[PDB]
Amino acid sequence: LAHIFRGTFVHSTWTCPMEVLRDHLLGVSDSGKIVFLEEASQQEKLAKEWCFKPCEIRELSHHEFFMPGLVDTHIHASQYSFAGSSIDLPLLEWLTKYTFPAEHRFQNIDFAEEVYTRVVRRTLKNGTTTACYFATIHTDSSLLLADITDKFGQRAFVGKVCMDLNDTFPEYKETTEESIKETERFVSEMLQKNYSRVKPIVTPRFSLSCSETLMGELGNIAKTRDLHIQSHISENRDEVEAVKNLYPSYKNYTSVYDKNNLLTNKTVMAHGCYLSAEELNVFHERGASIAHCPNSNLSLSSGFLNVLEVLKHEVKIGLGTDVAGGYSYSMLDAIRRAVMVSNILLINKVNEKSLTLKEVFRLATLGGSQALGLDGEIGNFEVGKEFDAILINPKASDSPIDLFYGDFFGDISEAVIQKFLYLGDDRNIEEVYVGGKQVVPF
Amino acid sequence: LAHIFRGTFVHSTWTCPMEVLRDHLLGVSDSGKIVFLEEASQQEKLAKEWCFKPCEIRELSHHEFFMPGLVDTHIHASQYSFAGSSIDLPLLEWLTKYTFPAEHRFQNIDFAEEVYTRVVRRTLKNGTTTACYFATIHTDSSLLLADITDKFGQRAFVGKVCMDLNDTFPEYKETTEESIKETERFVSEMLQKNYSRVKPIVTPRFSLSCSETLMGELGNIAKTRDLHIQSHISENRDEVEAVKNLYPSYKNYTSVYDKNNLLTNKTVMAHGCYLSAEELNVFHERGASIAHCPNSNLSLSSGFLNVLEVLKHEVKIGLGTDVAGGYSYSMLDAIRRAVMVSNILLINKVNEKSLTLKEVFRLATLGGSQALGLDGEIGNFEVGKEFDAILINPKASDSPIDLFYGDFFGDISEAVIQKFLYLGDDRNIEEVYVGGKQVVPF
């Protein structure tokens, strides 16, 4: 056994949005798997079965708790250099003014190295143990990202972006053939590295930047290598209308992807704000997933995803930060913003209720893992799963949270857990484990 | 002279939402006033006029800047103990379930001391140099808050809350006569202490907790002592309708206050989400102000204040955190949420545009100071004003912000300033000055 921990564990299950396991014992194997999880009353029994001494057990402080690692289902690693600025002009203006020039710089491998090192370190330290990254159109810089994530021990999908259409910034695109060849090369080189927890993902940027021909070939590569696919869908009203006019023969945005083999049981689509009920039924039937990106949706004045309607349709859904469209790199920010979007829908009388903080906590961990096809391996504390987890200390040095005796003995349930979700930050994250290995501190 | 600083200063003016003054020299007197502000080319001249040596000048790091202190126009100091929890059930449910029991504990002076010490230290360290506090109905605990704020050197209005109606938690109220006598005592004792920058403010909680009789007498006390008034107005639809049914003889919520001498040129009202155009004209004509509390308005599913409409009506407006209805104690959070509310109005097509980050920055500093009647003394860097300011270091130890060479030499304007406003936190606030005195570090 690599670790045995005693203390409080907080996670989600499909039948319980937030389950708090107090004074429990958890064991993690050498291979990084959770091998037991039981009440501490079972110490003697476990110590015999698993051959360990009581002195080998790490006891958490009385006010600390473990929770599962946060899962970021959509982030543009390549836009991190300007995250927290701009976020004003509209989205085609924006893409042209900020985004495409920033991504064009990734033709320089040394620039790539600086930005990607910073983004992987920053998200890990904020407790993002699994990330689904968009990189750039450049195969070699996108391979460097994969190598960086492996070095740091973060779990990740890395996607070389494809685009053969780009009218507003023509310096930043590939020919159709180039896009196909470079994707084939990216995937082969990724498979050659054989990284234990970093895999390639097929990434048409979106339907407006990829021809039918390209889309269809990317779909074939995904099928033949059995890979995940990631793209954007129905993020704003102008995009919805642009697609309608560039692809008039398709019934809706969803059909454009579906008929081109881009909507599979291993597909995740960012945004989804303007998907209709009919389109959600198609997501459900195909096993495709949505990455809810609430900060970006408000920051860029895009729209509101109706998460309650998505859940009613039994569509798989996780949370994403959508850096740099969303200005925050934090999944704690994404959780807060998700609660707020659901409240917006209640205020506007679209829905009759809002999402609870606990339901959103489940989206950020188990929901996200399900959205990326990883919920057999991660997302909560179940025997069999990889130990992807973060040790939270609400009383850490310089903590942004003020705890009072009432938070432990008063009349508000999960008071401390809720204050961490609403007020905490990286100062409260003392340790981060991915695959049972301690990755933070670095 | 107490200080002379050389470097970058960022502030608002009425004609410019964000003015960046690079390599400037600023002098602060012994009395805490700004005595000069000029380009550093004037060093020799100023050194002679004001009798100081070049070695006496404090040079800011090349990546640091001063900005004015943040002004929190509305916060319930007494609810800080449960901030970051709860925030789920509706507002009368909430008031009954969480708020009134928490405020009832302030009958214990030792409890008051702990909560109020923590809140004043926390807001100061987050750069809130001026705060307009609601305390509790207890005169002695509310006087302790005033004393605490004085000890720490924060500028503040402190308001003993009045309520003689409380059907849902009758243990927490005063009789009408008691309310009047205790307000008179609070004000007298505040004036006896003679604090240099902490003043009393008359505080009927809101029309639903104060009888006509009470409201009218509070209005007389304000008039006769020439005091500010603070209350809540038109925060949610149910409140609007409750007022209509408890005060059927008044034309609208605004009239209830106005006809009872509670709407004056020294009045600030929190929320205002459901004020009509006619009511805003009355605010404008009386000189009364609004405290925009966007985090609380979304957190409690209340509504959206249309800030563009408020500005179009030339109504005075600042920002507030509304702890604990809003879960964050940070004015940086309030700035971010304000931008987001204006974007909500653009997405819903109520407005044709949103507020810029710069306009919201102006609300958080100069707008707020104007809302509290203090814009002759604070809110920006102008000769004559008190030096209320915060030194920002975006590269501080453990900074949440990653700076890149491009933020200083690229094509995005005020990149660094914007990253601090969107991503910064208390780690970026190195020093806080109120009245020219350094109050942080403590």
Ligand SMILES: CC(C)[C@H](N)C(=O)OCCOCn1cnc2c(=O)[nH]c(N)nc21
């Ligand atoms: C007129 C329309 C075509 C509209 N202005 C438009 O082009 O929408 C673009 C955004 O669609 C998805 N998308 C593609 N790349 C990105 C991207 O990099 N970030 C985000 N948030 N969305 C993206």
Ligand SMILES: CC(C)[C@H](N)C(=O)OCCOCn1cnc2c(=O)[nH]c(N)nc21
């Ligand atoms: C049915 C209605 C009367 C409705 N449920 C209601 O009572 O609204 C109450 C909120 O009005 C203003 N208010 C009074 N005290 C507070 C308070 O402590 N926090 C906030 N955010 N608002 C407050």
Ligand SMILES: [Zn+2]
């Ligand atoms: Zn995106």
Ligand SMILES: [Zn+2]
């Ligand atoms: Zn309030």
